């Protein structure tokens, strides 16, 4: 099942997940893809999944197969590190000493 139709829409094999990988070497960063349950109704079922980098949990994202899903979950990684901008966690409160 490959052919050779490209055009308007590209279906390259993991377009962000090679995006990813890219940064994790240059920047070097550790990045694990973990893969959470399935999600969906008994005839369409939609496998779920999420990326780790710098120990940070990314917001999982849902794909019809296993690759799509870890494609997904990329996305929405990759789009924030171009930004880079990350919420403190841990808020300093009066501790002064």
């Given at each position: 099942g490959s052919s050779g139709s490209s055009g308007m829409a590209s279906?390259?094999?993991?377009?962000?997940?090679?995006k990813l990988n890219k940064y994790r070497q240059m920047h070097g960063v550790a990045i694990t893809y973990k893969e959470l349950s399935t999600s969906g109704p008994p005839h369409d079922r939609r496998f779920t999944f999420q990326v780790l980098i710098d120990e940070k949990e990314f917001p999982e994202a849902k794909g019809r197969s296993k690759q799509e899903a870890r494609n997904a979950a990329a996305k929405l990684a990759v789009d924030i590190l171009d930004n880079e901008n990350k919420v403190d966690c841990h808020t300093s409160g009066p501790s002064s000493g």
């Open positions: 279906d390259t094999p993991g377009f962000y997940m090679d």
